[PDB]
Amino acid sequence: SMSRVLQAEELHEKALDPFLLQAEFFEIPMNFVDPKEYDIPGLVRKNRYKTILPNPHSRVCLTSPDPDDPLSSYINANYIRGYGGEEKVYIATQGPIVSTVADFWRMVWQEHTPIIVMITNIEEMNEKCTEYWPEEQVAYDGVEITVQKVIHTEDYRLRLISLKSGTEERGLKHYWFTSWPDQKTPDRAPPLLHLVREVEEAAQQEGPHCAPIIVHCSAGIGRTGCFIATSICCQQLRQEGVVDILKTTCQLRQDRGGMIQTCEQYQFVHHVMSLYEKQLSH
């Protein structure tokens, strides 16, 4: 909707101009959802944040266990277009709360999601995210989740997981990124860029028409928007030799209100893309 195509030089300078960045960022409408849209008793129990709600056109609806029950079928999640508008590359969702852990896994099963990206720091567990995976094994509304392996790396912990419901077995990779910075300075960009590249490469290993990749921290918009915007713009940089973070943010906002919630987040994406362009140029 809005657009600012950045070539390399402007990109490096734009990332370092916070006055222009906030001018640009706060012109982007949030596109938040009127809470009246989900006037369903008990629904507020499924939301972490009463005013961060899934836009209805892109909302993920659960069909299990009662599709005729608007509360049973509700999850605070949206399909998110990827690079070039490709449909349903991601699902942005809130960190599960105790009342929605089973819903979250129902989503993962329903959507054939191969990859979860969790952008939540150690400190913020059981406040910004319920530990929704087992030590080894656990079962939710019919799907058995088995953590087969944990790979620790500097920037993230990767769990290899198996999901079994009845006769069907599927794999899942759970990337738990733990280096989200408090200060979104350029020295903190490399781990995010690394994660984006590792995830986009895991995604390619799933083959054609990869099922949606679930991305979350707490509300499903801020860090989640940063990760998705960075992933999209990395493809844009590789394919087009430019980045349009403003247009990408608008595309994200159209899918889910509030994606990239803070100007510090918005500037961080620019720091990450500036770093990546330098890497690519060598």
Author numbering: 256 to 537
What does the paper say about this structure?
STEP is a brain-specific PTP, and a validated therapeutic target for Alzheimer’s disease, Fragile X syndrome, and Parkinson’s disease. To compare the effects of temperature vs. pressure on the STEP catalytic domain, we used similarly prepared crystals to obtain three complementary crystal structures: one at cryogenic temperature (100 K) and ambient pressure (0.1 MPa), one at physiological temperature (310 K) but ambient pressure, and one at high pressure (205 MPa) but cryogenic temperature via high-pressure cryocooling. For the remainder of this paper, we refer to the structure at low temperature and low pressure as LoTP, the structure at high temperature as HiT, and the structure at high pressure as HiP. All three structures have the expected PTP catalytic domain architecture, including several key loops surrounding the active site region.
One notable feature of our new structures differs from the previous STEP structures: the active site binds two sulfate molecules. The bottom sulfate is well-coordinated by the catalytic P loop, analogous to the phosphate group in the phosphotyrosine (pTyr) substrate in PDB ID 2cjz41. In our structures, as supported by strong electron density, Cys472 predominantly adopts a side-chain rotamer that points away from the sulfate, thus avoiding a steric clash. Taken together, these observations support the interpretation that Cys472 samples both a rare primary rotamer and a low-occupancy alternate rotamer that is sterically mutually exclusive with a fortuitously observed sulfate bound at high but non-unity occupancy. Thus, although previous structures of STEP have sulfates or phosphate-like chemical groups independently in each of these sites, no previous structure has them in both sites simultaneously. In our manually modeled, deposited structures, LoTP has by far the most waters, HiT has by far the fewest, and HiP has an intermediate number. First, at LoTP and HiP, an ordered glycerol molecule is bound near α2′ and the Q loop. By contrast, at HiT, ordered waters are present instead, and α1′-α2′ and the Q loop undergo conformational shifts. Importantly, all three structures are from crystals treated with similar glycerol-containing cryoprotectant solutions. It is thus plausible that crystal cryocooling induces the glycerol to bind, preventing nearby conformations with potential functional relevance seen at physiological temperature.
